[PDB]
Amino acid sequence: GSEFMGAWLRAIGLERYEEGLVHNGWDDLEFLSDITEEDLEEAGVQDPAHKRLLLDTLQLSPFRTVSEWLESIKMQQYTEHFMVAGYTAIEKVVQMSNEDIKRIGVRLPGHQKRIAYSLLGLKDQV
């Protein structure tokens, strides 16, 4: 979580990077595990040893409706964005591309990625 991630970063000496991660949508420890080196660079983590430590540490440890699905990944702030753009049923959201996710107003990379990873699992399920 946003506070929990701050403590997690502080525990490994990477508190300096909290603001940049959070500002890029990497704001929840539960979903940080899919972050890549490239994502880190984009979020302000330039130092190779700092990226390595963050990534090494992460190694250690059917929905009926669109709103229910978004709630499961803590992305309910975007429910109206999806609904007004016509992505109003699970059978519609599973067809979305990364370009569609951005177009409808998901701007933060960590949120874009969270949604895209989650859709893979949904598509597999349906």
Author numbering: 1196 to 1256, 906 to 970
What do the authors of the reporting publication say about this deposited model?
The Eph (erythropoietin-producing hepatocyte) transmembrane receptor tyrosine kinase superfamily, with its first member identified years ago, contains 14 members in mammals and is the largest among all receptor tyrosine kinase families. However, the cytoplasmic portion of all 14 Eph receptors are highly similar, each containing a membrane-juxtaposing kinase domain, a protein-binding SAM domain immediately followed by a short carboxyl tail PDZ domain-binding motif (PBM). In this study, we performed systematic biochemical and structural studies of the bindings of three SAM domains, two from previously identified Eph-binding proteins (SHIP2 and Odin) and one from a new Eph-binding protein discovered in this study (SAMD5), to the SAM domains from every Eph receptor. Our study reveals that the Eph SAM domains have exquisitely specific target SAM domain-binding properties, although their overall SAM-SAM heterodimer formation modes are very similar.
ITC (Isothermal Titration Calorimetry) experiment revealed that EphA2 SAM bound to SHIP2 SAM with a dissociation constant (Kd) of ~2.22 μM at a 1:1 stoichiometry. To elucidate the molecular mechanism governing the specificity of the bindings of SHIP2 SAM and Odin SAM1 to Eph receptors, we determined the crystal structure of the SHIP2 SAM-EphA2 SAM complex and the Odin SAM1-EphA6 SAM complex at the 1.5 Å and 1.3 Å resolutions, respectively. The two complex structures adopt an essentially identical End-Helix/Mid-Loop binding mode, in which positively charged residues from the N-terminal end of α5 (End-Helix) of EphA2/EphA6 bind to negatively charged residues from the loop connecting α2-α4 (Mid-Loop) from SHIP2/Odin, forming the well-known tail-to-head SAM domain heterodimer. A noticeable feature in both complexes is that the backbone methylene of a Gly residue at the beginning of α5 from Eph SAM (Gly954A2/Gly1104A6) is in close contact with an aromatic residue from SHIP2/Odin SAM (Trp1221SHIP2/Phe738Odin). Taking the EphA2/SHIP2 complex as the example, a special cation-π interaction between the Arg958A2 and Phe1226SHIP2 was uncovered by the high-resolution crystal structure. The guanidinium group of Arg958A2 forms hydrogen bond network with Asp1222SHIP2 and His955A2 on one side and with the backbone carbonyl oxygen of Ile917A2. As such the guanidinium plane of Arg958A2 (and its delocalized π-system) is in the same plane with the π-system of the planer peptide bond between Ile917A2 and Lys918A2, forming energetically favorable π-π stacking with the benzene ring of Phe1226SHIP2. Whereas the rest of Eph SAMs contain a Lys in this position except EphA10, which is an Ala. Based on the structures shown in Figure 2F, replacing Arg958A2 with Lys would eliminate the planar π-system formed by Arg958A2 and the Ile917A2-Lys918A2 peptide bond and thus seriously weaken the binding, even though the positive charge at the site is retained.
